[PDB]
Structures are given as structure tokens and as C-alpha cells.
Design a protein around this motif. Structure first.
Motif, PDB file in Angstrom:
ATOM      1  N   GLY A   1       0.790  -1.217   0.000  1.00  0.00           N
ATOM      2  CA  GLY A   1       0.000   0.000   0.000  1.00  0.00           C
ATOM      3  C   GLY A   1       0.827   1.274   0.000  1.00  0.00           C
ATOM      4  O   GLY A   1       2.013   1.253   0.338  1.00  0.00           O
ATOM      5  N   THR A   2       0.199   2.386  -0.384  1.00  0.00           N
ATOM      6  CA  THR A   2       0.889   3.670  -0.449  1.00  0.00           C
ATOM      7  C   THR A   2       1.208   4.159   0.957  1.00  0.00           C
ATOM      8  O   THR A   2       0.298   4.381   1.763  1.00  0.00           O
ATOM      9  CB  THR A   2       0.006   4.697  -1.152  1.00  0.00           C
ATOM     10  OG1 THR A   2      -0.231   4.286  -2.504  1.00  0.00           O
ATOM     11  CG2 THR A   2       0.673   6.065  -1.151  1.00  0.00           C
ATOM     12  N   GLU A   3       2.496   4.343   1.240  1.00  0.00           N
ATOM     13  CA  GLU A   3       2.953   4.862   2.521  1.00  0.00           C
ATOM     14  C   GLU A   3       2.936   6.384   2.492  1.00  0.00           C
ATOM     15  O   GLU A   3       3.327   7.001   1.496  1.00  0.00           O
ATOM     16  CB  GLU A   3       4.375   4.371   2.798  1.00  0.00           C
ATOM     17  CG  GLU A   3       5.064   5.077   3.951  1.00  0.00           C
ATOM     18  CD  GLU A   3       6.533   4.726   4.060  1.00  0.00           C
ATOM     19  OE1 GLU A   3       7.377   5.640   3.926  1.00  0.00           O
ATOM     20  OE2 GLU A   3       6.843   3.537   4.282  1.00  0.00           O
ATOM     21  N   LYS A   4       2.476   6.989   3.587  1.00  0.00           N
ATOM     22  CA  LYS A   4       2.375   8.438   3.695  1.00  0.00           C
ATOM     23  C   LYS A   4       2.974   8.889   5.019  1.00  0.00           C
ATOM     24  O   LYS A   4       2.783   8.230   6.044  1.00  0.00           O
ATOM     25  CB  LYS A   4       0.905   8.889   3.633  1.00  0.00           C
ATOM     26  CG  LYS A   4       0.174   8.404   2.379  1.00  0.00           C
ATOM     27  CD  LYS A   4      -1.270   8.857   2.337  1.00  0.00           C
ATOM     28  CE  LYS A   4      -2.119   8.103   3.345  1.00  0.00           C
ATOM     29  NZ  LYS A   4      -3.563   8.437   3.194  1.00  0.00           N
ATOM     30  N   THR A   5       3.688  10.015   4.999  1.00  0.00           N
ATOM     31  CA  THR A   5       4.274  10.599   6.198  1.00  0.00           C
ATOM     32  C   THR A   5       3.419  11.783   6.614  1.00  0.00           C
ATOM     33  O   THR A   5       3.270  12.749   5.856  1.00  0.00           O
ATOM     34  CB  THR A   5       5.708  11.047   5.936  1.00  0.00           C
ATOM     35  OG1 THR A   5       6.510   9.905   5.615  1.00  0.00           O
ATOM     36  CG2 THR A   5       6.276  11.763   7.162  1.00  0.00           C
ATOM     37  N   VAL A   6       2.876  11.709   7.820  1.00  0.00           N
ATOM     38  CA  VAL A   6       1.948  12.694   8.348  1.00  0.00           C
ATOM     39  C   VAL A   6       2.669  13.443   9.461  1.00  0.00           C
ATOM     40  O   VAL A   6       3.231  12.819  10.365  1.00  0.00           O
ATOM     41  CB  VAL A   6       0.689  11.984   8.880  1.00  0.00           C
ATOM     42  CG1 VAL A   6      -0.292  12.968   9.432  1.00  0.00           C
ATOM     43  CG2 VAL A   6       0.054  11.149   7.778  1.00  0.00           C
ATOM     44  N   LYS A   7       2.682  14.770   9.383  1.00  0.00           N
ATOM     45  CA  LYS A   7       3.284  15.615  10.411  1.00  0.00           C
ATOM     46  C   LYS A   7       2.235  16.601  10.898  1.00  0.00           C
ATOM     47  O   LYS A   7       1.694  17.377  10.102  1.00  0.00           O
ATOM     48  CB  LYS A   7       4.515  16.350   9.875  1.00  0.00           C
ATOM     49  CG  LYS A   7       5.224  17.196  10.913  1.00  0.00           C
ATOM     50  CD  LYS A   7       6.720  17.229  10.656  1.00  0.00           C
ATOM     51  CE  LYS A   7       7.109  18.381   9.757  1.00  0.00           C
ATOM     52  NZ  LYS A   7       8.576  18.378   9.511  1.00  0.00           N
ATOM     53  N   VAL A   8       1.966  16.583  12.204  1.00  0.00           N
ATOM     54  CA  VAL A   8       0.768  17.177  12.782  1.00  0.00           C
ATOM     55  C   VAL A   8       1.149  17.886  14.073  1.00  0.00           C
ATOM     56  O   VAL A   8       1.942  17.363  14.859  1.00  0.00           O
ATOM     57  CB  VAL A   8      -0.271  16.076  13.088  1.00  0.00           C
ATOM     58  CG1 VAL A   8      -1.497  16.665  13.748  1.00  0.00           C
ATOM     59  CG2 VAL A   8      -0.656  15.356  11.825  1.00  0.00           C
ATOM     60  N   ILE A   9       0.583  19.072  14.288  1.00  0.00           N
ATOM     61  CA  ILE A   9       0.619  19.737  15.589  1.00  0.00           C
ATOM     62  C   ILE A   9      -0.563  19.232  16.405  1.00  0.00           C
ATOM     63  O   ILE A   9      -1.716  19.457  16.032  1.00  0.00           O
ATOM     64  CB  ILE A   9       0.508  21.261  15.441  1.00  0.00           C
ATOM     65  CG1 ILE A   9       1.394  21.803  14.315  1.00  0.00           C
ATOM     66  CG2 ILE A   9       0.796  21.923  16.786  1.00  0.00           C
ATOM     67  CD1 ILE A   9       2.799  22.106  14.745  1.00  0.00           C
ATOM     68  N   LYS A  10      -0.295  18.580  17.541  1.00  0.00           N
ATOM     69  CA  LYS A  10      -1.385  18.189  18.434  1.00  0.00           C
ATOM     70  C   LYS A  10      -1.689  19.406  19.296  1.00  0.00           C
ATOM     71  O   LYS A  10      -1.128  19.577  20.376  1.00  0.00           O
ATOM     72  CB  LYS A  10      -0.957  17.027  19.313  1.00  0.00           C
ATOM     73  CG  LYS A  10      -2.089  16.495  20.168  1.00  0.00           C
ATOM     74  CD  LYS A  10      -1.664  15.274  20.960  1.00  0.00           C
ATOM     75  CE  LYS A  10      -2.774  14.800  21.876  1.00  0.00           C
ATOM     76  NZ  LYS A  10      -2.335  13.689  22.774  1.00  0.00           N
ATOM     77  N   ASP A  11      -2.582  20.276  18.828  1.00  0.00           N
ATOM     78  CA  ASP A  11      -2.836  21.530  19.527  1.00  0.00           C
ATOM     79  C   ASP A  11      -4.028  21.467  20.474  1.00  0.00           C
ATOM     80  O   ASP A  11      -4.495  22.509  20.949  1.00  0.00           O
ATOM     81  CB  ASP A  11      -2.928  22.706  18.550  1.00  0.00           C
ATOM     82  CG  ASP A  11      -4.121  22.620  17.618  1.00  0.00           C
ATOM     83  OD1 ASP A  11      -4.833  21.604  17.615  1.00  0.00           O
ATOM     84  OD2 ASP A  11      -4.347  23.596  16.866  1.00  0.00           O
ATOM     85  N   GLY A  12      -4.505  20.267  20.778  1.00  0.00           N
ATOM     86  CA  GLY A  12      -5.555  20.052  21.742  1.00  0.00           C
ATOM     87  C   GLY A  12      -5.526  18.608  22.193  1.00  0.00           C
ATOM     88  O   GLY A  12      -4.686  17.815  21.744  1.00  0.00           O
ATOM     89  N   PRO A  13      -6.444  18.228  23.085  1.00  0.00           N
ATOM     90  CA  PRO A  13      -6.374  16.895  23.692  1.00  0.00           C
ATOM     91  C   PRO A  13      -6.874  15.776  22.807  1.00  0.00           C
ATOM     92  O   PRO A  13      -6.623  14.609  23.128  1.00  0.00           O
ATOM     93  CB  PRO A  13      -7.262  17.029  24.941  1.00  0.00           C
ATOM     94  CG  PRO A  13      -8.236  18.099  24.576  1.00  0.00           C
ATOM     95  CD  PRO A  13      -7.460  19.080  23.731  1.00  0.00           C
TER      96      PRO A  13
END
Length: 93
Positions: A1-13
């Protein structure tokens, strides 16, 4: 399957994910809540398998194990997640 790199600010709970597993393999994204951190992430979709979080290999892990890892990320912190898409039908036009 297509691999994806996710970069995220967890700005809440809460990220807005419902994660599950079928008893084997990788945990997967069952739901993404509208108006959530994850709904706003361009390259993540319902059905994606969660392969890694911050470099930890999540092969074989249950949804509750993956969930704790996501909950443990401190609010305000950026995290990375490797997601893999299942192979589903498509049309080339």
C-alpha cells in the motif's frame, strides 16, 4: 500500500480519530471526526493503517496500544505518523 508521512501539531487533547483493529496486523483509522485536527490533515484518510508514530514500529499492535501512544503526545507538540493506505479500486481516465 501507499505509505504516507503525516506531520501534525497536536494543539488540543483530541485528534479526532476512531482507531480499531481486527486482531492482527496494524491498527487502522475507522473514523475521522469532521472539524478535527485529523480532518484538516491533507494526507490521512479513513481506512489508513497506522504503521509508525514518532519512529516506533506499530506492526502487530492493537488499537488500544496505538491509542495510548497518541494520547501520550503532549498537547502543543508536533508528531509524525507513517500511514499506509489499503489497495482499493480506482479508475484512470
Amino acid at each position: 500500500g501507499t505509505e504516507k508521512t503525516v506531520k501534525v501539531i497536536k494543539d488540543g487533547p483530541a485528534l479526532g480519530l476512531t482507531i480499531s483493529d481486527n486482531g492482527a496486523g496494524y491498527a487502522f483509522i475507522k473514523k475521522i471526526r469532521e472539524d478535527s485536527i485529523m480532518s484538516r490533515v491533507a494526507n490521512v484518510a479513513v481506512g489508513d493503517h497506522i504503521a509508525k508514530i514518532n519512529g516506533t514500529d506499530l506492526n502487530g499492535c492493537r488499537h488500544f496500544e496505538v491509542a495510548r501512544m497518541l494520547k501520550e503526545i503532549p498537547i502543543g507538540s508536533e508528531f509524525t505518523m507513517i500511514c499506509v493506505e489499503p489497495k482499493k479500486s480506482e479508475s484512470k481516465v
